[PDB]
Amino acid sequence: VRSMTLGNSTITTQNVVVGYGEWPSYLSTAEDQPTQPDVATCRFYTLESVQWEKTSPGWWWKFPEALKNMGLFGQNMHYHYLGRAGYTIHVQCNASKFHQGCLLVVCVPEAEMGCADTDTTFPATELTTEDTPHVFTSDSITGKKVQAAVCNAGMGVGVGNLTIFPHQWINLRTNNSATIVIPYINSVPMDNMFRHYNFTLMIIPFAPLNFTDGATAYVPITVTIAPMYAEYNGLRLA
Amino acid sequence: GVPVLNTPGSNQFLTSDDYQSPSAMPQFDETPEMHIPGEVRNLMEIAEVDSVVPVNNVTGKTKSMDAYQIPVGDKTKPIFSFQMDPGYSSVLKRTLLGEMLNYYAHWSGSVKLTFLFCGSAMATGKLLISYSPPGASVPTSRKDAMLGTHIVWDIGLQSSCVLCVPWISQSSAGYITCWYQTNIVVPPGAPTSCDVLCFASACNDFSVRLLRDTPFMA
Amino acid sequence: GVPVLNTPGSNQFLTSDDYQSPSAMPQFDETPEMHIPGEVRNLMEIAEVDSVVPVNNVTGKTKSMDAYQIPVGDKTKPIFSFQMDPGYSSVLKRTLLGEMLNYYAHWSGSVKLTFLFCGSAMATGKLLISYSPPGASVPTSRKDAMLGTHIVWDIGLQSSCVLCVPWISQSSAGYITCWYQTNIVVPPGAPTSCDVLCFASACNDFSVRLLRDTPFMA
Amino acid sequence: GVPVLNTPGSNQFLTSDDYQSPSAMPQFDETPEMHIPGEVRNLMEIAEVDSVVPVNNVTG
Amino acid sequence: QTRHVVNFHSRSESTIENFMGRAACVFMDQYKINGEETSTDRFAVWTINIREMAQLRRKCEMFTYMRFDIEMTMVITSCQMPVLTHQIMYVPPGGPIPAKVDGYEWQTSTNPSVFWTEGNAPPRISIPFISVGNAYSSFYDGWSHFTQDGTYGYTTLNAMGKLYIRHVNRSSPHQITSTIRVYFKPKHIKAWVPRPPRLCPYINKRDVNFVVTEITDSRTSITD
Amino acid sequence: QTRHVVNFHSRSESTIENFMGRAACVFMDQYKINGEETSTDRFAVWTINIREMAQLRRKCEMFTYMRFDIEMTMVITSCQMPVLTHQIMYVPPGGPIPAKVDGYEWQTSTNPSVFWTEGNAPPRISIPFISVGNAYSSFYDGWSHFTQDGTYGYTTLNAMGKLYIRHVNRSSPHQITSTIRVYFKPKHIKAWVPRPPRLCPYINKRDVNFVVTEITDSRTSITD
């Protein structure tokens, strides 16, 4: 049991999957000069806990803008139009000893998702609802929204071989916590934080939750994101 | 000047050549290469990644995520059974392993399988994972599977048993059957029926030769 | 002789090649090169030269030299305001800076601005030159411009204030507004209305990549 | 570039030449050579082997 | 066939340059020589992108980011005269395009073009890494216009240019219908961030939309 | 499009040789093969000068003085026979010119000429720095004839020569109309004395005359 603290946010934790074997880092020019906030920003932003029942198909969050209303990070998104960060993501499950199940906690950089009924697009509020997650579906759906059927998560790939990305299994038999570090994967050193979704944290239950008639009918999944090494553009003159 | 003579093969266009193409934008200087995390420098680095194998791909459970779940919890018929060849096998053909191998005609190597038991932390039982050589016939009973190659995988102690199946190549393969050694013993509080996930990748190193077009795309 | 074979791309005419052209006048010996003053060896040596920026390019003042004159001498609306991008901006598109940048598609660098106050030697006042980042909105008031980036430029002390605007590139830009901090204080002898000239060049060094044809010529 | 001039015999196909053929499968790496018993490296190694001679090859 | 001892140890064919760097025909198109002075059927276009045919698109979607020089060689035919000369004009991402076969854009000095006359070896034109960023992005989970406007998934970093192709002969007595086959080839290719293979069939050439497909082919029971 | 982080540091494309040294088509012209034994429509002329088309002229007017070798490659077509052979005769500034397709000047040993037959690679002829002075002058604020006579702004130092082009075939059964496209290219170029860019549109190809144009595009107020 390790009680991590960052700024004015302390969580209680119980091995880290460093995404692509690199730890996030700063970009290191007088023509373009970055600003490193460091203060705040790096604290833990615990999202709303998500109840995982027997019939839950999955969830996804789209970062960096899932934190668009989360304190100083969410506020520096509006004053700087360029930025980058690292996002340590803790995912606890705090189930009991008699619950069973298994989760895939994967980050999937550049998850371009497909519309439900092709030949058209979706109204941009279907990919993300800031803090709250969009759930997947168990079967096919229609309408101007994301084709959120599992077995074809979002991108038209098999959902089983979604393990190529930075992932972590949460098998309630053994463990309950996951932690992933995603060192800002992008083709340009800095990019706008409202246009571009750098990665898509999606939690997908492979083995479904199961229990008997006495336990709690759900297992709350807690998601915590710590934006590390966030740096922005300069606002001062040179 | 220099007396030259054109050989057969001059002024032709061989599709697969490695000649110095005259650059159309010589003055142009391209963007400097930054360091982007996660470089791939060989395709067999994708095959070495574990990924879930849809063993329970029966006729009505392939468009849901019930394809990946092996139901555990009749001791006379095996739990599951499938050909051990990532090509031309419904179970292992759309795996990362089985999908980076359909780009090629000649491949040879070994393949490791991980069986993650996704049951309760109180459920306890034994499963017998038998392997048949590529020429042998499948075991029809549990005893006949015990007399060959097997691993009595105690679930209550470890929850993940790893294999490494050799002699996997094409240019009549093995079998990974699984048997109820014991039933799943469970206390009154925990549920009775559990699931077992499977995984597959390249065990140590994988050999692969002749590139071709994939059959899946039309 | 030497067995050669022609590759694809033989006997073609690529417009952008750097091959050894057979000289038509080989006997001819060209005139010796004398030293002529003022050699240009890079185009970005033209962009680094200051030149007057027509800020007051309103609908009827562009064919006269009233385009270059910013009238100074209502404190609620700013004196002038313009996009900070030498391309696709009416104010900075025909500057030496803005004109050697329309020959190119990819350019990135910084740009310095000099505000030469061309009033009397007795006129005294303050101007507040605010800069908005390329994502931010313009200040609607003088206080809101004071809370961002600014430089309270006292005219009575110095008559030329120099900026250096970074993050200027294309492949939604900044703003240089100017405000009446104080009015222009003038003795009885000197005139009341003054002018402010502006300048623009490359601040330290300028990066520029992809050559193209200019839009201006038809 | 280099001033060359084509000799008589350019752009012809002599059947018996030993020129560098452009390989159609350059990426392809061929199978390693194992040792197989009984290599022939000259045809006159077949002529040096005794063999029965049909001397009594009469009409029937 | 029979199961043989496939005994060897090699992964030189599995590298990225030996997997992606293969020439494939990506653009057939017709273009006439005479008639209809204001027509769009006297030249070709083909905006250069990796999402041309599904077989190569699938390979480009193994990886999120990749950078590579392209070296295309055209194979031009003709039907129905003099000896014909063609023009394959590559315009960069920042470049003017012709509207007619006799536009002024064809004479732009910044648009490199090859003038291949019929009978010779095929024309080869090589284009370096043009993109503004540091790699071409196969996928772009983002919006082109800020504040979640239209045009999802299309970034302007992975723009490669266009390829305008015409006859340079002004006219002809009879009709000549030329056919061009552009052979695209990645070169000096690097690739980052691996990605699972495509499962569903492709719908459209500018989006990732799909129909929900089964994971694998079904069998009768779990034990057969 | 969207504003990306255009992060790089390079000015190799902004040098003079990487700015001026680009091949541009500067002369299209027709010339027949037979008929009208005394006609001016059986050969081409094009007195070589930088003031051909406004797009390249604008670039040459960035600088007052410049010196450079020129390396032009012609692209010759034909319409309507035998195999055709052409002749591209470059006459120096001091050189006799033909008056007809069958003049004696075509046989002058001091006028270098290429004999390109149809079907091969395009003919390339390179001309060194011919001028009498030490550089070509883009502008000449002076009078050719002393004591302020006529012909303002034309110096004889920036004379480059002429380019007479004909068929060498004496006749033909039918009419053949050839088209030539001269691709001018500065080479090994130096430039002195920078100069502000042209603002007004061009009027004529031998003078600097112009119509008074506005400085920039107008906007509504000084503050919008």
DSSP, residue by residue, B117-172: E-S-SS-B-EEEEEEE-TTSPPPSSHHHHHSSEEEEEETTT-SEEE--EEEEEE--
Distance from the Cα of residue F224 to its chain's centroid:
45
Please report the resolution in angstroms. Answer: 3.8
Query: What's the gap between Cα C147 and its chain centre?
Result: 26
Q: Is B111 in CB contact (< 8 Å) with chain E?
A: no
Cβ-defined contact of E10 to D29 (cutoff 8 Å)? yes
Neighbors of chain F by Cβ distance (3+ pairs < 8 Å) = A, B, C, E
CATH label of the domain that carries residue A84:
2.60.120.20
Does residue C198 sit in helix, strand or coil?
Answer: strand
**Chain C, nearest residue to D6 by Cα:** C1
DSSP assigned state of F24: E
- CB atoms E21 and D31 under 8 Å: no
Q: Which residue of D has its CA nearest to C18?
A: D1
For residues F222 and C56, is the Cβ–Cβ distance under 8 A? Answer: yes
- CA distances F42 to F74, F98, F100, F182, Å, are 17, 11, 8, 17
Strand, coil or helix: A11: coil
Show me where the domains of chain B are located.
Answer: 1-218
CA distance F71 to chain E (A): 15
In this complex, do E203 and A118 lie within 8 Å of one another by their Cβ atoms? Answer: yes
Beta-carbon count within 10 A of C193 CB: 11
A and C touching (3 or more beta-carbon pairs closer than 8 Å): yes
CB B172 within 8 A of CB A81: no
Q: How was this structure determined?
A: cryo-EM
Main-chain dihedrals φ then ψ at residue C170, nearest 5 degrees = -145, 170
Breaks (C-N over 2.5 A) in chain F follow: 80
- Residues annotated within a binding site of A for guanine: 23
Round to whole Å and give the CA distance between F89 and B32: 46
β-strand C2-4 against B2-6: which pairing, if any?
Answer: parallel
Look up residue A31 and give its two tokens: 């023509």
φ, ψ of residue F36 in degrees (nearest 5): 50, 75
Q: Are E143 and E26 in contact (CB under 8 A)?
A: no
Q: Given E135, E142, E149, which is nearest A196 (Cβ)?
A: E142
Q: Cβ contacts of residue E80 below 8 Å, gap of 6+?
A: E174, E175, E176, E177
Q: Is the C-alpha dihedral spanning C79, C84, C89, C94 positive or negative?
A: positive
Distance, CA of B212 to CA of B215 (rounded, Å): 9
Which residues of chain C does A234 touch, with a Cβ-Cβ cutoff of 8 Å?
A: 166-167
Can you tell me the distance from the alpha carbon of F185 to that of F72, in angstroms, rounded to the nearest whole number? 6
Q: Nearest-CA distance from F8 to chain C in Å?
A: 7
Q: Tell me, yes or no, if E156 comes closer than 8 A to chain F by beta carbon.
A: yes
Q: Where in the sequence is the domain holding A193, given as residue range(s)?
A: 1-238
Neighbours of chain E (3+ CB pairs under 8 A): A, B, C, D, F
| Chain F residues closer than 8 Å to A81 by CB | 3
Q: How far apart are the first and last CA of chain C?
A: 54
Are the beta carbons of E178 and E55 closer than 8 angstroms? no
The class level of CATH for B1-218 reads mainly beta
Residue of E43, E73, E60, E51 lying closest to E184 (CA atoms): E73
3-state secondary structure B9-43: CCCCCCCCCCCCCCECCCCCCCCCCCCCCCEECCC
The CA distance from C111 to C85, in Å, is 9
Phi-psi region of A229 (alpha: psi -120 to 50; beta: other; left: phi over 0): left
Taking contacts as CB-CB distances below 8 angstroms, the residues of chain C near F15 are 41-43
What DSSP assignment string belongs to A170-221? Answer: EETTT---EEEE-----SSSSB-TTTB--EEEEEEESSPPB--TTS-S-EEE
CB E187 within 8 A of CB E68: yes
Binding residues of A: 23
* CA-based end-to-end distance of chain F: 23
Which residue in E has a C-alpha nearest to residue A156's C-alpha?
E200
B213–E16 C-beta distance less than 8 A: no
Sorted by sequence, the CB contacts under 8 Å of residue F62 that are 6+ apart come out as C43, C46, F191, F194, F195, F197
Within 153-212 of B, beta carbons closer than 8 Å to D belong to: 209-211
* Separation in Å, CA of B200 to nearest CA in chain A: 10
- CATH number of the structural domain E1-224: 2.60.120.20
d(CA A48, CA A220) in angstroms, rounded, equals 10
Asked if D24 is an interface residue toward chain B (Cβ–Cβ < 8 A), one would say yes
Kindly list the residues from chain D whose CB atom is less than 8 angstroms away from the CB atom of residue E18: 27
Longest dimension (CA), chain E: 73
What is the tally of structural domains in chain A? Answer: 1
Q: Which of C19, C212, C214, C216 to mutate to test the interface with E (most CBs of E within 10 A)?
A: C212
CA distance E209 to A66: 23
The CA R_g of chain E, rounded to the nearest whole Å, is: 22
Which H or E run contains D47? helix D44-47
Please indicate whether, in this complex, the C-beta atoms of C133 and A235 are within 8 angstroms of each other: yes
**Of F201, C9, A213, A110, which Cα lies nearest the Cα of E88?**
C9
Chains that touch A (3 or more CB pairs under 8 A): B, C, E, F
CA B28 from chain centre, in angstroms, equals: 45
Note whether F7 contacts A: Cβ–Cβ < 8 A. Answer: yes
Q: E74 pairs with which residues across the strands?
A: E182
**Inter-chain contact F4–A195, Cβ cutoff 8 Å?**
no
Residue of D nearest to C23 (CA): D1
Distance between CA C13 and CA B215 in Å, rounded?
Answer: 40
Amino acid code (one letter) for A119: D
**Runs of H (alpha helix) within A81-189:** none
Q: How far apart are CA A64 and CA A50, in angstroms?
A: 19
Subunit contact F5:A32, Cβ cutoff 8 A = yes
Window 119-158 of A, Cβ < 8 Å to F? none
Gap from B158 CA to chain E (nearest CA, Å): 24
Give backbone dihedrals phi and psi of C126, rounded to 5 degrees, phi first. -130, 140
